[PDB]
Task: inverse folding
């Protein structure tokens, strides 16, 4: 109801910074939340490929 982003994955996220991987949907990160801006979203299910590529969880290798 508040998606002001265009490119895929990169969606509006108030607290950015770290994220999750295809092995750690949740990475331990203190109060290191980046300012509000379009970026990846772990709470939704986006993971960063080993190449640091923010992509849906299903967009993972085999």
Result:
């Amino acid at each position: 109801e508040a998606e002001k982003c265009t490119k895929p994955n990169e969606q509006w996220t108030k607290c950015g910074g770290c994220e999750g991987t295809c092995a750690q949907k949740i990475v331990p990160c203190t109060r290191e939340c980046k300012p509000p801006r379009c970026e990846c979203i772990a709470s939704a299910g986006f993971v960063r490929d080993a190449q640091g590529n923010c992509i849906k969880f299903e967009d993972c290798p085999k």
